[PDB]
Design a protein around this ligand. Structure first.
Ligand SMILES: *[C@@H]1O[C@H](CO)[C@@H](O[C@@H]2O[C@H](CO)[C@@H](O)[C@H](O)[C@H]2NC(C)=O)[C@H](O)[C@H]1NC(C)=O
Length: 317
């Protein structure tokens, strides 16, 4: 795993600062913050307004989020800078206290990419609660890449990409901070997710990998968005956030919790929105940038994906 000093940011600090926002507070003076890293094709609010923003508030946290432009569709390496900058700011803004990081979809990949290549944040992140993370990308994006209808981050989240290869070879497939991965075998966006073993895209060695079906049975069905908004997910997430170990405890949830519908504590209005979470994301992807090649890896990541091909050609150290 990489060690030492953090790589330089490619973006100006003021640009990175503009992507961070906290509910009812400034990042420089926030109490018990929680960083929410959104999914592909959405902004912080679009990913969490109907779920984890109000739910984390009810848990005693001040929700904060990053909204990398445009809609998390650009280079994942850049989206991560927003997160690293956010952590640095929220940590100092909370009296130098570690803070939890909750994520959805691509947001998990960004968190892990950050913990792997940016050593400084490893002592600033308390725990990681990842919902439907795609550390190994997804095989379902291959076809889209071939037609060149994929955004920069879709190329990178494709199984076999230079980005996912660089993460694996750098040792990013092992948890770096206490991590809880809640996913579903019936995820229509991320695959493979059916083996309930290291082959799954949301699996991290030494982490609390929770495949919903392994707990609720083969008849339990929650999709990509469901992995984030379901009552089952709220219970597992609450467990992860409260745990003294930093990971979700099996003793905190059981079959009773196997409710595929949105979290009970959500207002009926928030429930309807949470059920249609994927709608805005699909819209953003249809209207967003599209290209015919995977974005070039930044210098700090090239040594780990030699031989792979990106927009400029073959990768060399
Ligand atoms: C989207 O990602 C690209 C690729 O990382 C960013 O472009 C780079 O930006 C830096 C800083 O401005 C430049 O020094 C590089 O030359 C750019 N590279 C390329 C290939 O364009 C871009 O800034 C990001 N845009 C947004 C809105 O996040």
């Amino acid at each position: 795993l990489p060690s030492g000093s953090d790589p330089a940011f490619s973006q100006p600090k003021s640009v990175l600062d503009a992507g961070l926002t906290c509910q009812g507070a400034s990042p420089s003076s926030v109490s018990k913050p929680i960083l929410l890293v959104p999914g592909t094709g959405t902004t912080g609010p679009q990913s969490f307004d109907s779920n984890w923003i109000p739910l984390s508030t009810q848990l005693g946290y001040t929700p904060c989020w990053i909204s990398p432009p445009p809609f998390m569709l650009n280079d994942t390496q850049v989206n991560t800078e927003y997160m690293v900058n956010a952590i640095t700011a929220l940590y100092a803004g909370s009296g130098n206290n570690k803070l939890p990081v909750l994520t959805w979809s691509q947001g998990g990949l960004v968190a892990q990419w950050g913990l792997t290549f940016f050593p400084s944040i490893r002592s600033k992140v308390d725990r990681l609660m990842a919902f439907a993370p795609d550390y190994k990308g997804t095989v379902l994006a291959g076809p889209l890449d071939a037609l060149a209808v994929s955004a920069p981050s879709v190329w990178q989240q494709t199984t076999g990409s230079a980005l996912t290869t660089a993460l694996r070879n750098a040792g990013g497939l092992t948890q770096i901070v206490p991590t809880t991965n809640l996913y579903s075998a019936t995820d229509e966006i991320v695959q493979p997710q059916v083996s309930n073993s290291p082959l799954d895209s949301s699996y991290l060695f030494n982490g609390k990998n929770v495949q919903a079906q392994a707990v609720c049975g083969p008849l339990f069905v929650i999709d990509h968005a469901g992995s984030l908004t379901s009552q089952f997910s709220y219970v597992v997430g609450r467990s992860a956030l409260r745990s003294t170990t930093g990971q979700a405890r099996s003793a905190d949830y059981g079959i009773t919790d196997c409710n595929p519908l949105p979290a009970n504590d959500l207002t009926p209005e928030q429930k309807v929105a949470a059920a249609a979470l994927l709608a805005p994301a699909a819209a953003a992807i249809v209207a967003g940038p599209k290209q015919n090649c995977e974005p070039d890896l930044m210098p700090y990541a090239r040594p780990f994906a030699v031989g792979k091909r990106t927009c400029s050609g073959i990768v060399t150290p």
